[PDB]
Amino acid sequence: HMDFKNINLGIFGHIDHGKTTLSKVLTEITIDIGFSAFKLENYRITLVDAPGHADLIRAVVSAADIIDLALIVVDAKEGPKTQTGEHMLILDHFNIPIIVVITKSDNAGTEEIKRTEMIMKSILQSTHNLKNSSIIPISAKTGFGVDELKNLIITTLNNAEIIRNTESYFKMPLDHAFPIKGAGTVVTGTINKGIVKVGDELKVLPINMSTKVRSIQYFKESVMEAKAGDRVGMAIQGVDAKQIYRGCILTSKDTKLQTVDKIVAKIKISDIFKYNLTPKMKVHLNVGMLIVPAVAVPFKKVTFGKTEENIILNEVISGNECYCAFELEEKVLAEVGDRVLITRLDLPPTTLRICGHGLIEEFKPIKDLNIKKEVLREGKVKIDKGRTVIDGLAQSKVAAEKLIGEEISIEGKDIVGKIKGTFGTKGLLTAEFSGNVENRDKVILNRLRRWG
């Protein structure tokens, strides 16, 4: 017959915004994630039903790595609520195509739908990748425009660039695992990269055991081979279902995966203004399917003409370099280039909880990055009759004497000099610099410091 294409479709939104009901209406043609399937044209669509509740947002994050498309639901009448945004954020950081779906249109008037419709359009424009994503009102109960919703899901998939990675090693996470006996265990999960054929030897991590694929169940059917993008049921032998829990990852023996403690990421910030750069900060880092508490130290990479140095952020977010050395409390399974998600989940469900996202560049501890502090103190040149004295670099005599012999330039005048001695008990300074110095000139003291 015809060749089908394997598609994962997310469904996100606030609690009671009509996710599940939309799910059921699609399937026929929430603590954990829901899993279902339906066909549209030659698209085999495996539905990922995300939990609305905000204590379950761990599931929501972990529902993103799988999907190539999503539906964000929002009640017509009461419009977007708090979770609607974090789901929106999450998908936007991970560059997942969305279709905003306005549910419960039968419970609202034309006016109230148009309002909420526009409110969404306003919001979508405040997001990087989701800038303009279609919007349809539907009623799952009434069937209103459900027909269109499907025709859109088709169009969207026809446009979106879906890259199945067959080439790299087999890499697949494990959602649920349930036993049969001591010599067998069945694990489910959608395949990230690579290929598996029945009777292959793979391995569970982080526990690092070696098992063999007895069965591939895909789409309620037993097949010899599975590919990346397929959500498969998998029976393997050489492990008990007890050892395998939420964070386990099934992959081949050529894997690039590593169990990691220290992470260095290239961080982009979600909302600037909610963002703060006070280093050595306590957050909850999302890697893979886990959430590990962490400490982050933001920094930038500035070439000084010879050697590139890692400089603790000067608080300027101008230019896109907010690298972040993470140090995790627990361990985590990661690879280079894996998208990382910085969250603060300590907060109430009522406030946006995403402290940003980024690509993992290196696995490296803060200590070996050679972190350094850009150090600037600013004084003024005060000149009386026959004497030049710099003021403001030092508050007292000791502070001043410690400064003697440092580097000093004058702002805007392209001139250099050196600070020789201390003048006064109030911490003034003397210097020998190039001539043509003037009163009320600006003196910029510059040096590199050991940070923390």
Ligand X SMILES: Nc1nc2c(ncn2[C@@H]2O[C@H](COP(=O)(O)OP(=O)(O)NP(=O)(O)O)[C@@H](O)[C@H]2O)c(=O)[nH]1
Which C-beta is closer to ligand X: that of 55 or that of 401? 55
Least distance between ligand X and beta carbon 176 (Å): 18
Smaller CB separation from ligand X, 19 or 284: 19
Binding to ligand X by residue 85, rule CB under 6 A?
no
Distance CA 44, CA 164 (A): 14
Minimum CB distance to Mg ion smaller for 30 or for 237: 30
Q: Please tell me the number of Cα atoms within 13 Å of 390 on its side-chain side.
A: 31
Q: Which residue numbers come right before each break in the chain (C to N over 2.5 Å)?
A: 29
Q: Please choose which of Mg ion, ligand X, none residue 430 contacts, taking the beta carbon within 5 to 8 angstroms, the exact cut-off set by kind.
A: none
Q: Which of 44, 93, 104, 353 binds ligand X (CB under 6 A)?
A: 104
What the block records as the tokens of 137 is 């009102």
Q: Which residue is nearest to ligand X (CB)?
A: 52
Residue 391 binds ligand X, judged by CB under 6 A: no
127 known member of a binding site: yes
Q: How far is the CB of 18 from ligand X (least distance, A)?
A: 3
| DSSP string covering 384-398 | ETTEEEEESS-SSHH
Cα dist. 97→6, 71, 90, 158 in Å?
Answer: 16, 9, 11, 12
Tell me which DSSP letter residue 145 carries.
T
Part of the chain binding ligand X (CB under 6 A), chosen from 19-27, 91-99, 215-223, 335-343: 19-27
The 127-146 site mask, x for binding ligand X (CB under 6 A), equals ------------xxx-----
Query: Does residue 310 touch ligand X according to CB under 6 A?
Result: no
Q: Which of residues 22-61 bind ligand X (CB under 6 A)?
A: 30, 51-52
Q: Which does 106 bind (CB under 5 to 8 A by kind): ligand X, Mg ion, none?
A: ligand X
Number of Cβ within 10 Å of residue 384's Cβ equals 8
Residue 62, contacted partner among Mg ion, ligand X, none, CB below 5-8 A by kind: none
* Residue 21 within binding range of ligand X, rule CB under 6 A: yes
Query: How does DSSP assign 242-253, residue by residue?
Result: TT--TT-EEE-T
Site string for ligand X, 170-209 (x = CB under 6 A): ----------------------------------------
Say whether residue 281 binds ligand X (CB under 6 A): no
Any binding-site annotation on 214?
Answer: yes
Phi, psi of 354 (to 5 degrees): -105, 110
The site for Mg ion (CB under 5 A) is made up of: 19-20, 30
Residue 13, phi-psi category: left (phi > 0), alpha (psi -120 to 50), beta (remainder): left
* Phi, psi torsion values for 401, nearest 5 degrees: -70, -25
Beta bridge partners of 296: 281, 326
Contact between residue 375 and residue 446 where contact means Cβ atoms under 8 Å apart: yes
C-alpha–C-alpha distance, residues 172 and 227, integer Å: 10
**Residue 62 sits in the site that holds ligand X (CB under 6 A):** no
**Calpha distance 117→135 (Å, rounded):** 7
| Secondary structure of residue 285 in the 3-state scheme | strand
Number of residues that bind ligand X (CB under 6 A): 18
Contact 105/113 with Cβ under 8 angstroms?
A: yes
Q: Which residues are annotated as a binding site for Mg(2+)?
A: 20, 30
Q: Which residues are annotated as a binding site for deoxycholate?
A: 33-35, 217
Q: Which residues are annotated as a binding site?
A: 16-21, 30, 33-35, 104, 106, 127, 140-141, 214, 217
Residues that bind ligand X (CB under 6 A): 13, 15-21, 30, 51-52, 103-104, 106-107, 139-141
Q: Which residues are annotated as a binding site for GMP?
A: 127, 214
